[PDB]
């Protein structure tokens, strides 16, 4: 099934933050309304943040996360969780190798902000 | 119901990160086996990542998140989600007022690391 | 924080299913647009399905789950999770006693159907 | 990533319930420690419960859900959610066609019981 794609409310601000846990340099692309809106790049084997930014969900609200290492796409796992019918988390895990810990690049999208 | 309490696998390293979205200064305490192991604080209405740290769950694996503003405990909401039976996220939201956005202090705990 | 309240897309069919795990008789009331649409009453310590129906979220899309035992409201815990940005589950747990297992009456709402 | 596989606590009773939403007859196989423990077969386009039962996770605690239609394995999506650090839901969606509603066979596993 498709992973890393989330429908957020339209024209709404959201936070996107990426953490790295791999020997490989992670490249996290965030697409909004089918256009690259942000790109984070970094390396860490200790969960360091490699990027955090506030973006706008665009006209459709479609937000997609893609992760690659040196141009090679990582396999993704994702889900959205809503607490007290109002607080949203769009979560993404990614695997750049074969140990399947899926934490090589961990991406957290949260809204609302402010 | 109790919120902000999570049982992690024993003696496991995990990351804990806090975000702020409020006019009030947030203070986040992370307890391991009932004793504070990390504290973050900051003031942002733009999702600033006010703190992050790597901790060890210890023999009990018990982790609890508490959020306060000016010495007043915020109301918490939380849940744990596991992706592909391996990637874990312990999520916490908090409300320091009455506008019910529950994002005043958002905390994300993730494991495994590395 | 408020629990057991979910905002579903309007005029959408959804399933609601209740399970019982307690010595006490569980009364599960499902409100759609603030009006009772279904009620299940049963006792089991072995997860019997005390009720399962298909309801329409109506014009409001507001769905609320209430659980009581002999007229006394149970404390609720809830969350919504979305898989592959399309499959939705609204989850509810409830506690009627002191052991805090929150499974005394478990309710699962799922959509879309068909 | 692999989907439909969950690690439950050892020797623990859990509930498994399957719903159908497809023109095709769904065959849901529930494996415990890599051995078939239960099978639900049925057809419905109205979320009918095609099976509900109580199983034991055994020593390994390994539980896997497989879904097929006409012998063809459906594509699965899954996640585990834990509320108030006590109530567990292992959720599975499956797609037997191309409309990607992933509700063709919906499986809900919950524990603890009692
Ligand atoms: C150190 C190793 O680097 C990799 O690329 C990762 O796939 C492994 O999970 C691990 O983090
Ligand atoms: C600016 C406001 O600050 C308050 O303290 C928060 O409770 C509100 O949600 C909002 O962030
Ligand atoms: C048998 C007991 O019944 C009580 O009413 C419940 O609160 C307990 O969790 C347990 O199920
Ligand atoms: C009636 C249709 O049956 C197909 O086989 C399913 O894939 C569709 O989602 C739909 O339920
Ligand atoms: Ca890896
Ligand atoms: Ca890794
Ligand atoms: Ca607030
Ligand atoms: Ca706020
Ligand atoms: Ca109880
Ligand atoms: Ca119980
Ligand atoms: Ca389908
Ligand atoms: Ca279907």
D100 to chain A, any CB pair closer than 8 A? The answer is yes
Resolution value in angstroms: 1.2
Contact between chains at C103 and D81 (C-beta distance less than 8 A): no
Determine how many CB atoms are found less than 10 A away from the CB of residue A98: 5
| Mutational test site, ligand 1, from A96, A98, A106, max ligand atoms within 8 Å of CB | A96
Q: How far apart are CA C61 and CA A67, in angstroms?
A: 35
Mapped onto helix, strand or coil, the DSSP state of residue D110 is strand
Structure tokens at B26: 């947030």
Which among A90, A102, A86 has a CA at the least distance from the CA of A64? A90
**What DSSP state is assigned to residue C4?**
S
Q: Which of B24, B75, B84, B96 to mutate to test the interface with A (most CBs of A within 10 A)?
A: B84
Q: How far apart are CA C103 and CA B37, in angstroms?
A: 31
Backbone angles phi, psi at C58, to 5 degrees: 70, -175
Q: How far apart are CA B60 and CA B79, in angstroms?
A: 19
Which among D29, D5, D102, B56 has a CA at the least distance from the CA of C111? D102
Instruction: Work out the burial of residue B11: count CB atoms within 10 Å of its CB; fewer than 13 is exposed, 13-18 middle, 19 or more buried.
Output: exposed
Which among B73, B64, B62 has a CA at the least distance from the CA of B105? B73
Q: Answer yes or no: are the C-beta atoms of B9 and B64 closer than 8 Å.
A: no
Q: How far apart are CA C23 and CA C97, in angstroms?
A: 10
Q: Which of B1, B81, B85 to mutate to test the interface with C (most CBs of C within 10 A)?
A: B1
Contact between chains at A102 and B89 (C-beta distance less than 8 A): no
Which among B75, C3, B67, B47 has a CA at the least distance from the CA of A108? B47
**What DSSP state is assigned to residue A107?**
E
CA angle centred on B3, ends C40 and B24, rounded to 5°: 125
Structure tokens at B81: 């989600």
Structure tokens at B38: 């990390």
Backbone angles phi, psi at A33, to 5 degrees: 55, 45
A vs D, Cβ pairs < 8 A, gives 20
Which among D109, D95, D89, D102 has a CA at the least distance from the CA of D37? D109
- Distance to chain B for A95, nearest Cα, Å: 11
Dihedral, D32, D38, D44, D45 alpha carbons, nearest 10 = -10
- How far is CA C11 from each of CA A27, C56, C60, D88, rounded to the nearest angstrom? 41, 6, 8, 29
**Up-side HSE of residue A95: CA atoms within 13 Å toward CB?**
18
- Method in brief: X-ray
Q: Answer yes or no: are the C-beta atoms of A55 and A109 closer than 8 Å.
A: no
Q: Answer yes or no: are the C-beta atoms of D109 and D62 closer than 8 Å.
A: no
Q: How far apart are CA A34 and CA A65, in angstroms?
A: 11
DSSP string computed for A30-98: EEETTEEEEEEEEEEEEEEEEEEEEEE-TTT-EEEEEEEETTEEPEEEEEEEEETTTEEEEEEEEESSS
Instruction: Please give the CATH superfamily to which domain B1-114 belongs.
Output: Calcium-mediated lectin (2.60.120.400)
Which among A82, A79, A29 has a CA at the least distance from the CA of A53? A29
Residues 6+ apart with CB under 8 A from C98: none
């Amino acid at each position: 099934a498709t992973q890393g794609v989330f429908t957020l409310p339209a024209n709404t601000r959201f936070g996107v933050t990426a953490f790295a846990n791999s020997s490989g340099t992670q490249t996290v692309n965030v697409l909004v309304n089918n256009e690259t809106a942000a790109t984070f790049s970094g390396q860490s084997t200790n969960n360091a943040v490699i990027g955090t930014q506030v973006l706008n969900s665009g006209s459709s609200g479609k937000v997609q996360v893609q992760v690659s290492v040196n141009g090679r796409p990582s396999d993704l796992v994702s889900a959205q969780v809503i607490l007290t019918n109002e607080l949203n988390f769009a979560l993404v895990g990614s695997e750049d190798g074969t140990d399947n810990d899926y934490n090589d690049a961990v991406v957290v999208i949260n809204w609302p902000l402010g």
